[PDB]
Write an enzyme that holds these catalytic residues in place. Sequence first.
Site, PDB file in Angstrom:
ATOM      1  N   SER A 435      55.975 -11.897  34.402  1.00 40.88           N
ATOM      2  CA  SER A 435      54.863 -11.765  35.334  1.00 40.88           C
ATOM      3  C   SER A 435      54.850 -12.943  36.292  1.00 40.88           C
ATOM      4  O   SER A 435      55.033 -12.787  37.504  1.00 40.88           O
ATOM      5  CB  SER A 435      53.537 -11.690  34.583  1.00 40.88           C
ATOM      6  OG  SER A 435      52.475 -11.392  35.469  1.00 40.88           O
ATOM      7  N   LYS A 478      47.821 -12.328  43.560  1.00 42.83           N
ATOM      8  CA  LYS A 478      47.803 -13.600  42.842  1.00 42.83           C
ATOM      9  C   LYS A 478      46.972 -14.644  43.581  1.00 42.83           C
ATOM     10  O   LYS A 478      46.197 -15.385  42.959  1.00 42.83           O
ATOM     11  CB  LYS A 478      49.231 -14.105  42.640  1.00 42.83           C
ATOM     12  CG  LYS A 478      50.192 -13.070  42.079  1.00 42.83           C
ATOM     13  CD  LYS A 478      50.082 -12.976  40.569  1.00 42.83           C
ATOM     14  CE  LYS A 478      51.317 -12.335  39.959  1.00 42.83           C
ATOM     15  NZ  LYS A 478      52.567 -13.097  40.219  1.00 42.83           N
TER      16      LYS A 478
END
Lengths: 531, 265, 73, 145, 72, 73
Positions: A435, A478
């Site tokens: 990830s 993100k």
Amino acid sequence: SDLEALRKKIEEVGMPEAVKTKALKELDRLERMQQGSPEATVARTYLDWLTEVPWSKADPEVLDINHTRQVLDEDHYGLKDVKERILEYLAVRQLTQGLDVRNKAPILVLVGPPGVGKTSLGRSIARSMNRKFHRISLGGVRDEAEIRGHRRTYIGAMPGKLIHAMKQVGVINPVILLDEIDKMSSDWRGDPASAMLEVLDPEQNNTFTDHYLDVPYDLSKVFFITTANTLQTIPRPLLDRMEVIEIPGYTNMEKQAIARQYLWPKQVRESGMEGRIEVTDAAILRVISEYTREAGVRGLERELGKIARKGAKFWLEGAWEGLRTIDASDIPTYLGIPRYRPDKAETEPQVGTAQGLAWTPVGGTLLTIKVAAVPGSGKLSLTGQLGEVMKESAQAALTYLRAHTQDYGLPEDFYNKVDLHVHVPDGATPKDGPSAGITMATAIASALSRRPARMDIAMTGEVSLRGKVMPIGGVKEKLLAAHQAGIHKIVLPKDNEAQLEELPKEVLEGLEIKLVEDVGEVLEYLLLPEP
Amino acid sequence: QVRESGMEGRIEVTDAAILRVISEYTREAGVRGLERELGKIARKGAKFWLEGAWEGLRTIDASDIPTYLGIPRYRPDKAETEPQVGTAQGLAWTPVGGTLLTIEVAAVPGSGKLSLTGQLGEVMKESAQAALTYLRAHTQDYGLPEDFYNKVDLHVHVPDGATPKDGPSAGITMATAIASALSRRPARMDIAMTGEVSLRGKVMPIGGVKEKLLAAHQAGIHKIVLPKDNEAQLEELPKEVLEGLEIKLVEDVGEVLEYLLLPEP
Amino acid sequence: QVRESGMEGRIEVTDAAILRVISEYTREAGVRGLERELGKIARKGAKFWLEGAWEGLRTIDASDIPTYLGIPR
Amino acid sequence: GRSIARSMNRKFHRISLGGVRDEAEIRGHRRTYIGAMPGKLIHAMKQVGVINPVILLDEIDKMSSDWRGDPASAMLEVLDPEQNNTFTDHYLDVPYDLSKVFFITTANTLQTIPRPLLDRMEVIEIPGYTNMEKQAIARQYLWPK
Amino acid sequence: GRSIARSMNRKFHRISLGGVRDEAEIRGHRRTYIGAMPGKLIHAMKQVGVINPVILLDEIDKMSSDWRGDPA
Amino acid sequence: TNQRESYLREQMKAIQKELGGEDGLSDLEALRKKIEEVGMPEAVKTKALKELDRLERMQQGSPEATVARTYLD
């Protein structure tokens, strides 16, 4: 009553020839001496379903790109890519090979989560071409009985949300808010996914084969807007004729500004007091940074909706104050403990923490991977319903630290003696391999150093066996996750530093971003001491 | 797309703009994803004209398409890759076609043992071991210590599956990533790798050679190490494909292993 | 082959031609790759005769093997 | 632990850990034969009817794992009951509501308890009794037993 | 395939059959019940009016047998 | 209540004996006219007649009759 009104609302209430035929065949099917057959009773229902279906009531449409621009400019703050798609949806609707809305080019399906107010956009499209807008819900629905209806040989046929949809709206060309389309399975009597294909396609929407409607309906000039919730669960007959409309997320300052501007009037309209409710910017950030993190703002609608409901609750007891100063006192009174601890407590300086940016299908996230690099027999012990991509990340980062060991005084061999007890709290991440392999790399480097972590930084990027951080996609989510965490330092790969120039700068104002490309560049960035 | 999408003669594209779209937006072997790209081009240009007919034919090139699409999301002309100090250009075939499966190989010290990561066949790892065995005959001349199978471990990662072809199309691709990882030296640019090693260390004829030359030039890769028996099969290939493809006609693994290893210093 | 391919009195194929085809193209010991090779040869020659009935017998021998076919495998 | 169990009114249960060698021992095994069974800690919910019993751990000093890895990450998952809510398993594949279970432990040797499981416990050192204590409790309970 | 259809004056009704688990999905069903449905191919051939259209078949390399009765 | 519900329902099935079954058989007549314009093999014509024995069900508009109308489609 209805026997005389429905007799005369067939031929003067304007209705298309595909529908006027069944209206006349139910004029002849009914009016037969007050026919008491069960098909006549469900046809007594059905003729009411088939007369207030809105036709000969179109409202004026515009085939220019310029009026297409400014009405959606009035609808929303900004459509950085949606404006492109509606503006070609109208500028080439006057230019394609058919010139009308008869399902040649794909409809404006609002693919993605339901995370924006799907009502008010439909309201402003009903304002746009002067039309009317209606809300439905295909939630709970996976059958032709409740897409379309039941068979016409007994009593019990209720239609689905389609004829409910184009019953409770009032134009030829409506904005039909098709909600929860994504939950679809073909459960019984063949495929009810083909029923939404019959909603969707050019051929079977004017030849709308329905169980409740024996003669075909025309969904001819019916505008179709569609709001599903998930993208992987949509049927392929629904995946016919799709054009993509994106769904964005927002920062703390952006959710603050939109919670001031574009979402507070909807909730104080639902409570019914426009302007009586004051939620200050300190109180707005107090609700937002302690209650919401994810991308959707229909999720943010509920947090002010409960505030509006409690304001209505305080208002019905008596309006003793025109304005109520919601200070810092009364906010922990409501809901007790807020859902998020205030910032830098998950970003406490810890050996075992992983303060970085992981990726979830709902959006970019932050997740603390519990690393316990205890001195054992070097055994790789992993728990947490962990997938093979977790190992593919873990041994990659481990072998990078095999290749990058002696810079920090680490001993000559660890993978033979340091038992790795790394625990991802979640199952696995669909982000490619790792990830954020540098997040777990900073966690494991903190664990190997036995040293606490750093402040205001959450890192993202996967790990190479060559010691590189390859450029990752979806860096916006993100960055939104770190801004929603109060975290203002985010490293990225160099082509993701070009994605900085790809990404819009309204998001990127509240953060600071460093220049990394290798995995060892970021390991200094989550450690309280330099060793 | 001029005919169908309403952009009838209102847009000039250069083929430079189109190849920018191909090289940086969809590197597909086929063109259906590139037909999506071209429809997106036709749409994105198609929103400009009815705003005011400033041009009856809008010249679009690499200058104004970053307004319309953006940056290189992918490196255009994938001849130039990452400096392959420990890796190599991937060159692999998939059901969707040409893929640059750039092999991750970590040549870390240890016991000389193997550790595989990904959908990796053990025959692919034995191909890697045969390449190792070739370099077990090729240590000091390749600038390596004689002892590594006792002291330099293997960690290896082939993107997803090792090779959708059963058998290593990417055997020399893995091997060149291994050799660069061992040497810590740049495998040289444009040179993509298809084929595999024998136990005598030969790049034997591979089968499906046309598809990996497709995989080369779809990336804009113009340098290829290939078997000489595939040079026999190269003249079979229609040369419109083979334009822009400098091809090295090997049979030995040592020929490529003396080729991309030029910056040993 | 030349009967069941409908290729009647149109091609000559020597046993040297068959020798080069088998020795260089298919090493199946049974007759299962050989029928593929032989139908492929008749396939090529059938196309060639379709653009013309020039010769009484098309010359195919061991010399012109890579003319009527691709690379010897 | 028996006095603790009755205090929290939870079904007390006895489960030891000595001799676990494999991670898939703590997990289940794959659905490969007739009558296949889930993991050990999901099986800890088969002797109990509710998801809050008192099950008393034993003998982590006898732990070693000849498999790659330890099950001591799964007993570290036991050391945090919400990590048990993502329990890796094979036959059943269930993220469970194992959070409510009361946890209580035993191991008669603290040093050979592994370093994965050598933190966040308090040393409850319980040796035997005297001559006179055992003499008293024999006629108190045991000879009445 | 459309060019082949235009060449031989044929029609071109392509039809996909991907991801199909049943032989009863490529094949038809039994008329003794409801929930009974043909192949996609039978419905496809219903469309045309000639017995030589270009009938296109799609990606049998990406098929699998999952239910009782092999789809291929 | 089942007697009178079935009595009104057989007024419906009497119209389906009279008017609705004629419309279903008119769909079958249109596709049988397409049978005589393209031309079945007479065993396929026989099978159209066979599942027209599964059809031609004047007693009720069965789901079997619907799926055999799909069959004759």
